[PDB]
C-alpha cells in the first residue's frame, strides 16, 4: 500500500495509538477556532453538501461528518485508521445517523469506497502544516473524487518570516553549558558540550510570540489541494527573498499556516497566524546556527527545503544570506522532534519598541 | 534474545531513541538526590569496589561507572543499548579512564562479557519502580555475577497507601465529563462518557502530594535483587490490608519506592517518598473511577496486580473494598501512559 511504503511501522504504531485516545480528540475539538471554523465553513456552504456524497479522511471521532450531516449530505464515508473509528461508530448510532454516515476503519490508502464522492473533507494539518504527512493521504483520497468535486479545505498557505529573539538563541547555549563543567561529581563533561549544542539546534521550537519580533513581511507557499498530487509534497522547496522592514539580528525563521474552504457561497479561512487567536497548532520557529545582521532595506534571501522521511515528518534544511554583505547561515532540523516551549504567559515584545515615552503614557 | 522476546519492536525503538538524547541524560543527572545518593553509596562503600570488576547495566552517559572508578574499581564494563554509548566513550577518553572503564554497546541480554564481575551497578528504576521493565535487565545481568557478588541497589521497596484528594478526582472527572455533553456543536457525545471515564482513569497521575492526604499507613512490597529472578517480575501480586486512620472518601492508592545499597561499610537509602525531597520520579497515584467511603478504624483490603506487557510496562489491576460495608472498586491502569500533572 502507498501508506506502508512511505511509512516506517514503528512510526505508524505510535502515531495511530496517539489518535486512539479520546483525550486527544477532546484537545482538538475544544480548539474553538479550529472546530468552529470548520463548522462555519461547512454549514455556510450548505449547497456544497446538500444531498451530496462526502468523504471524511481521518474522521477521528467523526465530528466533521456530523457537520456535513447537519448541512444536508446524503451519504458520508468516514475513514479512520486509529481505534477511534470504533468510538465514531458509537456516535453515529447514538445520533441516529447510521443511514447517512458510514464509518470505514482503516487507512484511506487501503480501504475501498462503494462509490465516488462529490466533496472530500478532512483536517490533515500538522504543526508547520506538513508534519504527520497527512496532506499526502488527503491528496491520495482524490482517487475517489468526481471530476467536478471539491475539497474542504481547498488550499493551504505556509507563511515564513524572519524573526529576532536574542533570548531564544542564547537559551540554546545556556542549556548546553550544563556539560561545560570540569567536575560534575568529579567527572569532566566538557567534551559533550558541542554535541548538546548540536542536539538543541536540530529541534524546531513550537511556541507563540509577539509579532513585533518579525523583521519582514512573510512569504507564502501555497498548496492547491484540488491540483496538487501526492508527490508534490515529497520535496517542498520554499525560496524566499525577505525585504527587511527592521534592522537587527535575524536568529531564524518563524512558520505558521492558513487554510481556505472555497465554497460555492463563500470562502472561509482558518488561520494560525501569530496575529490571530492562539490555536493548538501554535507557531513554529527554526533557529539559524549563527545570527545574521541585517539593516532595514536589505534583502534576506535563501531556501527552506523540506524533505519527507519515513517517520511521517520532514527533515528541514534552511539556508539564508543577507545579499548586501554576503553573510550566510544555515541549519538542519527534525520537524518530528520539536521543543514545546509554550509556557502560558503573554509573549513579551522585543526591547526597544517604544517610540514614545512610556512614562508619558502611564496616565494616557 | 530474552529482551527481543518480551519487548515489542516499536516500543524498543522509541525507548532507546529517548535515551539517546543528551537532554534526557541531563534530566536524570541533574536530579541531585538521585545522582548524589548513588555517588555517596558507592564511595562510602569503597571496599566493595576497590580492585573489583564491575558491570554497569544501562550506563547512559557513564556517570555511575565514573563513581565506581573513583571508588577504586580495577575494570568496569559499562553496557548501554542506546546511542549514548558513543557519548559515554567520549567521556571515558576525555577523563583519561580508558584503562578502567570499557563501554560495551548493546543490550545487556545480548552482549558478551570477557569475564564475570564482583558487583553490578545500575539505575533501572522507573516511576512506580517497575515502569520500563529495566529491573528485569538488571536481574538478567546476574548471569555475569560471581556467586557471592553484590548488587547496587540491593533491594527495592514499593509502598502503597490510600489517599483522599477531591480536587484531583474532580479534575479528572471533569475532563472525562466533556463526553457527557448532549450537544457539542449540535452533536450528542454522551454515549462515549463511559469510555471516556475508563480512558482518563486508566492514566496514573505523576506528581507530588503531602503526606496528610494519606488515610492509612502504607504497605510494602520488597524485591530483593540479590535473590530475585527476572521471571518473578512478569506478574507481581501485592495484597494489602489498610487500617484506615481517617474517615472520608478514598479516591485511590498512592505509590512510591525506596531502594537500599547494602554495602560492606554501610547501607545507604534512596527514597522517593512524599516526605522526602522531590526526585524526577515524583510519586504515582492510581485513581478509582468512584471513590470508596471509609470510616476511621475500617479496613480497606484488596489486591494490586501488575502484569508485564510487551511495551516495557505493566497493566495495573487494583481491586479494593471496604470490608465493613462491602463497597468495592475495580480499576485497570496503563502504567506506560501516565498523566503528568506537575
Amino acid at each position: 500500500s502507498v501508506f506502508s511504503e512511505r511509512t516506517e511501522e514503528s512510526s505508524a504504531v505510535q502515531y495511530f495509538q496517539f489518535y486512539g485516545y479520546l483525550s486527544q480528540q477532546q484537545n482538538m475539538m475544544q480548539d474553538y477556532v479550529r472546530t468552529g471554523t470548520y463548522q462555519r465553513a461547512i454549514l455556510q456552504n450548505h449547497t456544497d453538501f446538500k444531498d451530496k456524497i462526502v468523504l471524511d479522511v481521518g474522521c477521528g471521532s467523526g465530528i466533521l461528518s456530523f457537520f456535513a450531516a447537519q448541512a444536508g449530505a446524503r451519504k458520508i464515508y468516514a475513514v479512520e485508521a486509529s481505534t477511534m473509528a470504533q468510538h465514531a461508530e458509537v456516535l453515529v448510532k447514538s445520533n441516529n445517523l447510521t443511514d447517512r454516515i458510514v464509518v470505514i476503519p482503516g487507512k484511506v490508502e487501503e480501504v475501498s469506497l462503494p462509490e465516488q464522492v462529490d466533496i472530500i473533507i478532512s483536517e490533515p494539518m500538522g504543526y508547520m502544516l506538513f508534519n504527520e504527512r497527512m496532506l499526502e493521504s488527503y491528496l491520495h483520497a482524490k482517487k475517489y473524487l468526481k471530476p467536478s468535486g471539491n475539497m474542504f479545505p481547498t488550499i493551504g498557505d505556509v507563511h515564513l518570516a524572519p524573526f529576532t529573539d536574542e533570548q531564544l538563541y542564547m537559551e540554546q547555549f545556556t542549556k548546553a553549558n550544563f556539560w561545560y563543567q570540569p567536575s560534575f561529581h568529579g567527572v569532566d563533561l566538557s567534551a559533550l558540550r558541542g554535541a548538546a549544542v548540536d542536539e538543541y539546534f536540530r529541534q524546531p521550537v513550537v511556541d507563540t510570540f509577539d509579532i513585533r519580533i518579525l523583521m519582514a513581511k512573510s512569504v507564502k507557499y501555497t498548496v492547491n489541494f484540488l491540483e496538487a498530487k501526492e508527490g508534490d509534497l515529497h520535496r517542498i522547496e520554499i525560496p524566499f527573498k525577505f525585504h527587511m522592514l527592521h534592522s537587527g539580528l535575524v536568529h531564524g525563521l518563524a512558520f505558521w499556516f492558513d487554510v481556505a474552504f472555497i465554497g460555492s457561497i463563500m470562502t472561509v479561512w482558518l488561520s494560525t497566524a501569530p496575529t490571530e487567536p492562539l490555536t493548538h497548532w501554535y507557531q513554529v520557529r527554526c533557529l539559524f546556527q549563527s545570527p545574521l545582521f541585517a539593516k532595514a532595506g536589505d534583502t534576506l534571501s535563501g531556501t527552506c527545503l523540506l524533505i519527507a522521511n519515513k517517520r511521517q515528518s520532514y527533515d528541514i534544511s534552511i539556508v539564508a544570506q543577507v545579499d548586501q554583505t554576503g553573510s550566510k547561515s544555515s541549519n538542519l532540523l527534525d520537524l518530528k522532534n520539536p521543543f514545546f516551549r509554550y509556557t502560558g504567559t503573554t509573549p513579551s515584545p522585543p526591547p526597544g519598541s517604544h517610540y514614545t515615552s512610556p512614562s508619558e503614557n502611564m496616565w494616557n | 534474545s530474552v529482551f527481543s522476546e518480551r519487548t515489542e519492536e516499536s516500543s524498543a525503538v522509541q525507548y532507546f531513541q529517548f535515551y539517546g538524547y543528551l537532554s534526557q541524560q541531563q534530566n536524570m543527572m541533574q536530579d541531585y538526590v538521585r545522582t548524589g545518593t548513588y555517588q555517596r553509596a558507592i564511595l562510602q562503600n569503597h571496599t566493595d569496589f576497590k580492585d573489583k570488576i564491575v558491570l554497569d547495566v544501562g550506563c547512559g552517559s557513564g556517570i555511575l561507572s565514573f563513581f565506581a572508578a573513583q571508588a577504586g574499581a580495577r575494570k568496569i564494563y559499562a553496557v548501554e543499548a542506546s546511542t549514548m554509548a558513543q557519548h559515554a566513550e567520549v567521556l571515558v577518553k576525555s577523563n583519561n579512564l580508558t584503562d578502567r572503564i570499557v563501554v560495551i554497546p548493546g543490550k545487556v541480554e545480548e552482549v558478551s562479557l570477557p569475564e564475570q564481575v564482583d558487583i553490578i551497578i545500575s539505575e533501572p528504576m522507573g516511576y512506580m519502580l517497575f515502569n520500563e521493565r529495566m529491573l528485569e535487565s538488571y536481574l538478567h545481568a546476574k548471569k555475569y555475577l560471581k556467586p557471592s557478588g553484590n548488587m547496587f541497589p540491593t533491594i527495592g521497596d514499593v509502598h502503597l497507601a490510600p489517599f483522599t484528594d477531591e480536587q484531583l478526582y474532580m479534575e479528572q472527572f471533569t475532563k472525562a465529563n466533556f463526553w457527557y455533553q448532549p450537544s457539542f456543536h449540535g452533536v450528542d457525545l454522551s454515549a462515549l462518557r463511559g469510555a471516556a471515564v475508563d480512558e482518563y482513569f486508566r492514566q496514573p497521575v505523576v506528581d507530588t502530594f503531602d503526606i496528610r492526604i494519606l488515610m492509612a499507613k502504607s504497605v510494602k512490597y520488597t524485591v530483593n535483587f540479590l535473590e530475585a529472578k527476572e521471571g518473578d517480575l512478569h506478574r507481581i501480586e501485592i495484597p494489602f490490608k489498610f487500617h484506615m486512620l481517617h474517615s472520608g472518601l478514598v479516591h485511590g492508592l498512592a505509590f512510591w519506592f525506596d531502594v537500599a545499597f547494602i554495602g560492606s561499610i554501610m547501607t545507604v537509602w534512596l527514597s522517593t517518598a512524599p516526605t522526602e525531597p522531590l526526585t524526577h520520579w515524583y510519586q504515582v497515584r492510581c485513581l478509582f473511577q468512584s471513590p470508596l467511603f471509609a470510616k476511621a478504624g475500617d479496613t480497606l483490603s484488596g489486591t494490586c496486580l501488575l502484569i508485564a506487557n510487551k511495551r516495557q510496562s505493566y497493566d495495573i489491576s487494583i481491586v479494593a473494598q471496604v470490608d465493613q460495608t462491602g463497597s468495592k472498586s475495580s480499576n485497570l491502569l496503563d502504567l506506560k501512559n501516565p498523566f503528568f500533572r506537575y
Binding site: 512510526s11 505510535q14 502515531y15 496517539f18 489518535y19 486527544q24 484537545n27 482538538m28 475544544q30 480548539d31 500538522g126 504543526y127 508534519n131 504527520e132 513550537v206 492562539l278 490555536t279 493548538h280 497548532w281 501554535y282 517517520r311 515528518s313 520537524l335 518530528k336 522532534n337 520539536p338 521543543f339 514545546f340 509554550y342 502560558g344 | 522509541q14 531513541q17 529517548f18
Partner: peptide, 12 residues
C-alpha cells in the same frame, strides 16, 4: 521523540 509521543500539541 516529542512528535512521536504528541503529534498534536495541547491547548488550554
Amino acid at each position: 521523540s516529542t512528535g512521536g509521543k504528541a503529534p498534536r500539541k495541547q491547548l488550554a
